[PDB]
Amino acid sequence: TCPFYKKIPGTGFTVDAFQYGVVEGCTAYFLTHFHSDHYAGLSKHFTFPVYCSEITGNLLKNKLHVQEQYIHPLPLDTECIVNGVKVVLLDANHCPGAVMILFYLPNGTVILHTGDFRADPSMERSLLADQKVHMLYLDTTYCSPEYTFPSQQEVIRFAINTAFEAVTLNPHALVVCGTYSIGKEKVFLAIADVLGSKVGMSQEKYKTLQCLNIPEINSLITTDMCSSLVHLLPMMQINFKGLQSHLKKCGGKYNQILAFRPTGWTHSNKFTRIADVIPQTKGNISIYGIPYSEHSSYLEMKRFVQWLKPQKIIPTVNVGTWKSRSTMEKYFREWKLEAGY
């Protein structure tokens, strides 16, 4: 059955709750973003109302084949009424079309559901600042102090300079970027822009990008692999064997590969800075691991919550074991005692 952390008290709403069949009492199902864990269970067979951003609606329609009559897209930063209740969608700074939802309950309680998010200080001057928020449903992915990472901009700068140098040294080098869902598109778009190239990709991946309301998208991407010097492949193929194999397929148009694996955190965040990063190399193929995150670091999450001063926090990630819940509760209490709420 649908857990209490996916239910909004004193409404018939749920959030990211599509895997449990019909939820008893639910009149509207919200979807924060188009990642499979969150949408799991949605298909052309679903016949209840779904509320979401415009981008998330394009994806539901075109990729999942959810029928149009059930898609209710809402604009961002706008007070809207849903089934008698005031809501606002806000940018979550996660992947394209990802939202946080603000719910103003009839009794006067205010609830923020973050979805998946990367906390940023620009969120401190949104509509959130206008009133007290009583309850917070929080993306706790990286809720432990070891989880540090550079800014998105530091990581992009590094990727840009690295790719530019390699292709100026060898104009027959190909650049490859790994991918498994939506998100982290700036990696491959910024590399292609410094090289004066479009991004080449499969038909399925191109169809995904064509849903994302990216300005001038037709000038940035193509299905003609031949004509382009940055290619996208599934993350699973970003290894020496997969990359040599792809290089055979391209028709000796390239004689070297430089590849990027954008990942979350892995244990080497605790010493290395982005400027120290060096690749793994075997022959004419090099692979760089770059920690481009679309989730809050511990420090970014702590700042956001200390500003917001919620009366209660409800975790939405790593809630499956008592040890994790216990550890998270300890950090929430520290934050509260330091900030005085």
Residues within the interface to Ni ion (CB under 5 A): 35, 116
CB of 205 to Ni ion, least distance (A): 18
Q: Which residue is nearest to Ni ion (CB)?
A: 116
- Sign of the CA dihedral running 164, 271, 262, 119: negative
- CA 128: distance to chain centroid? 21
CB of 116 to Ni ion, least distance (A): 3
**Could you tell me the end-to-end alpha-carbon distance of the chain, in angstroms, rounded to an integer?**
34
CB of 54 to Ni ion, least distance (A): 18
**Which residue type sits at 313?**
I
97 or 200, CB closer to Ni ion?
97
∠216-192-94 over CA atoms, to 5°? 70
CB of 33 to Ni ion, least distance (A): 6
174 or 182, CB closer to Ni ion?
182
CB of 94 to Ni ion, least distance (A): 6
DSSP letter string, 55-98: HHHHHIIIII---GGGEEE--SS--EEETTEEEEEEE-SSSTT-
> d(Cα 99, Cα 152) in Å, to the nearest integer?
19
264 or 279, CB closer to Ni ion?
264
35 or 198, CB closer to Ni ion?
35
139 or 313, CB closer to Ni ion?
139
> d(Cα 285, Cα 270) in Å, to the nearest integer?
27
